[PDB]
Amino acid sequence: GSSGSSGEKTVRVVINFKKTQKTIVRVSPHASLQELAPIICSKCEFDPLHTLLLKDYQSQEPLDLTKSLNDLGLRELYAMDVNRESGPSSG
């Protein structure tokens, strides 16, 4: 991990949630959603334990954590609340 030295060079992203409410936060577009999962969910006091990252409120396609706002090329995203945690992990 990493505490986080300095918190500058951040972009304004839109966090759509509840398919009704939305909020804006300033975070690094570089960091992968995987790392901005909590930074975001937290901002929306959401549970990153069972949270998904869809394109936008409209679209329902899942995004790639590994990919960042840059890699993705989006300024806004939606946080979906599902329930699924099971599978192997190693490489």
Side-chain angles (χ1 to χ4, degrees):
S2 217
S3 196
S5 285
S6 256
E8 293 292 275
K9 304 173 150 110
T10 37
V11 297
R12 275 170 183 277
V13 172
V14 160
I15 308 289
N16 282 287
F17 70 88
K18 271 210 209 235
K19 270 169 139 95
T20 46
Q21 287 182 263
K22 58 134 155 112
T23 179
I24 290 202
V25 302
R26 243 140 144 290
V27 287
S28 236
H30 282 285
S32 327
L33 286 165
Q34 159 166 338
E35 256 304 295
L36 298 173
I39 287 125
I40 285 166
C41 267
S42 296
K43 288 269 182 200
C44 255
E45 284 167 52
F46 258 27
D47 167 285
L49 254 164
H50 330 280
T51 274
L52 254 187
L53 300 174
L54 301 300
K55 306 256 286 258
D56 34 286
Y57 160 96
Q58 209 231 38
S59 253
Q60 291 137 4
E61 243 147 315
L63 310 149
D64 252 17
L65 305 155
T66 53
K67 304 252 106 168
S68 336
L69 285 288
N70 251 312
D71 312 355
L72 298 150
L74 303 165
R75 260 281 243 290
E76 71 240 274
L77 48 117
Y78 172 78
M80 187 133 76
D81 238 351
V82 306
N83 210 96
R84 223 157 136 203
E85 186 89 285
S86 73
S89 267
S90 211

